[PDB]
Structures are given as structure tokens and as C-alpha cells.
Design a protein around this ligand. Structure first.
Ligand SMILES: Nc1nc2c(ncn2[C@@H]2O[C@H](COP(=O)(O)OP(=O)(O)O)[C@@H](O)[C@H]2O)c(=O)[nH]1
Ligand SMILES: Nc1nc2c(ncn2[C@@H]2O[C@H](COP(=O)(O)OP(=O)(O)O)[C@@H](O)[C@H]2O)c(=O)[nH]1
Lengths: 161, 161
């Protein structure tokens, strides 16, 4: 209602690492052995991911491209700090309502990213090679400020204390 | 027309085996030698795929699970004939408007599948291992009816002369 209907209906649960809601809906039987990965991985995993205003999914990164796909709701800012230190922002949403928004956004592997919404957004989020906690890094405020001092504001807004 | 804005904005072209409008938006750098695949494959490819009423994507199949994700518009019937010959139908869409629809539908590899809509639908469709024409089969009316005589109606509706 509408957020709760979607949480009920899709059986989302509060995301350990984030201010949002999720459930992994698919994990492929097929495996890849990929350099830079410790061990076999699944070819693909997909979650539902729902976000609400006020609670930013904080900076984090993985070893795969992460593909976001907009299902419902408002737009979703996806903040990105790339390894060369540069900052970009992609808008996930519906260009029919917001011309700068796209229904697909691919976050390159190794980019630190965080996300915020002004209302709520339901997304499907896919990762290939498939998600595994050994490949996940939750960013620490102080380490990120030290690495990227020129991005202090966005880092402050999108990390916990 | 909403359709043409999407076709314009997402640069869709009409689907060779269609249809159906599409564009491959992403193909992963990472590869993976999966048994039963002739050669390496990308781990993941994604397309926009847009459908309108009266024009059924005909029956086809690939060697990968194929994941549909609903972006905009009405529901999309996904007809499936599975290797054991049984028939199922998944509804891709928004369960807030249609209780039985879902934002994600995974078509298992090797299933023959076809899709129709009553209005229009924009979906993102992902394949892992990533799409490659050597893995694709377009269904032939005659061979499919030979194979699955109990599903003549649906094969008739979703194949071309
Ligand atoms: N598949 C997938 N899972 C994710 C992603 N981000 C976070 N997770 C999940 O975090 C979930 C929580 O597991 P975990 O927190 O370690 O167990 P718990 O905290 O004791 O309930 C796992 O199911 C992971 O799937 C993602 O992008 N993909
Ligand atoms: N990536 C991907 N591509 C698809 C899918 N279905 C059809 N195609 C595409 O079909 C396209 C064929 O290009 P096409 O327009 O036929 O060029 P042509 O050979 O001159 O006709 C390729 O770009 C494939 O990507 C799919 O599920 N995924």
C-alpha cells in the first residue's frame, strides 16, 4: 500500500546491507569459473529491490556489473564513484515521466555505488557473475573519504557513522 | 503514442524473428565455457523488448534461462511448451493492477515459448549465458504440431504459416 502490498506480495525483507527491501528471486543452475573470483560462481542472480525516501542504500561495490531494471515507482538516483575517482550519477526510472531517466542502468564492476529515491521505487537487480558475499564490499565512511576526499558530501549522505 | 516514444527513445528496431521491437543494450565482457554451448559465451546480455497487440512473438527457444522483467504497459502472456510436452502460461505485469501478474518471469532453458499482449508492453529481457544465434531455434508450425499435437491451438495462434 503500495509499498506494503509489494513487500507482502513479493515477500521482501529489510536488506542487511541497505535502507531498502529485497528478496533473491533467481539463481542460475549454470556456473562460471571467472578470473578474479574465488571459486565457481553462478552465471546470474536476480533480486527484487524496493527503496523508500530517507534511507539511502549506502556505498558498496561488487566484482560484477550490476544491472538495475525499473519496475514501478519514482526515479532512483544511482550515485557512482569509479576507481579513477570520478563521480557520475545515473537516473533509473521512466523517461515518459522524467526525460533523463532510463529503465535500465548498468553499474560497472568495481564502481562504488549508492542509491536514493524521493518517493519509492521497485527495481529488479541482476548481477552476473551471480552475487556471492565473498565478492561484496560495504564501504566504510572513513576509508572512502580518505580515498575520495573530493566526494566527501555524497559519501557523508550515503554512509552510516 | 507511447509506443513510438519508447521506440524513439530506446532506439528499438523491429524484431527479425518477430514481433516485437528490440535492441541489445548490454553484453558482458566476461565469458564462460558452459557445457552444451558451442564456444565461449558472454555471461549476460540484455535487450529492451516491446510488444503490441495482434503480433505474437512466435514460438522459439534457446539454451539459457531467459528472464523477462516488466518495465511499462499492460500484461504479457508468456506461453510455454516444456520438453515433457506440458503447457503453462506465465503472466508478466504489475500485480497492483492485475493480481495474477508478476514483474519477473523466468523462462527455463529449452522450453518453447511465445508471447502476446492485449495492449503494449515494454520489457527488459536477459539471457545468461548471453544470447548467441547459434543457440536459437525458431519453431516451425509443422514440426511443433508433430511434436505437441495436444497444443495445436496455441501453436497455430503463435507461429507463421
Ligand atoms: N542475490 C543477491 N543477494 C544479495 C544482493 N545484495 C544482498 N544480497 C543478499 O543478502 C542476503 C542476506 O543474507 P545474510 O544477511 O548474510 O543472512 P542473514 O543476515 O543472517 O539473514 C543474501 O540472501 C544475499 O542474497 C544481490 O545483489 N543479489
Ligand atoms: N541479446 C539478445 N539479442 C537478441 C535476442 N533475440 C534476438 N536478438 C538479436 O537479434 C539481432 C539480430 O540482428 P539482425 O537485426 O537480425 O541483423 P540481420 O542479420 O541483418 O538481420 C542480434 O543483435 C541479436 O542480439 C535476445 O534475447 N537477446
Amino acid at each position: 500500500e503500495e509499498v506494503k502490498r509489494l513487500i507482502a506480495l513479493y515477500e521482501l525483507t529489510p536488506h542487511p546491507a541497505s535502507g531498502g527491501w529485497f528478496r533473491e528471486t533467481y539463481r542460475s543452475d549454470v556456473q562460471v569459473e571467472a578470473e578474479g573470483f574465488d571459486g565457481k560462481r553462478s552465471v546470474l542472480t536476480m533480486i527484487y529491490y524496493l527503496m523508500q525516501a530517507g534511507q539511502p542504500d549506502p556505498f558498496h561495490r561488487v566484482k560484477s556489473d550490476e544491472t538495475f531494471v525499473h519496475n514501478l515507482g519514482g526515479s532512483m538516483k544511482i550515485h557512482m564513484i569509479h576507481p579513477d575517482g570520478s563521480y557520475s550519477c545515473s537516473i533509473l526510472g521512466n523517461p515518459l515521466e522524467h526525460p533523463e531517466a532510463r529503465h535500465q542502468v548498468v553499474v560497472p564492476r568495481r564502481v562504488w555505488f549508492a542509491q536514493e529515491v524521493d518517493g519509492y521505487c521497485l527495481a529488479s537487480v541482476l548481477v552476473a557473475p551471480g552475487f556471492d558475499f565473498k565478492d561484496f564490499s560495504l564501504g566504510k565512511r572513513e576509508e572512502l573519504i580518505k580515498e575520495y576526499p573530493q566526494h566527501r558530501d555524497v559519501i557523508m549522505r550515503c554512509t552510516s557513522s
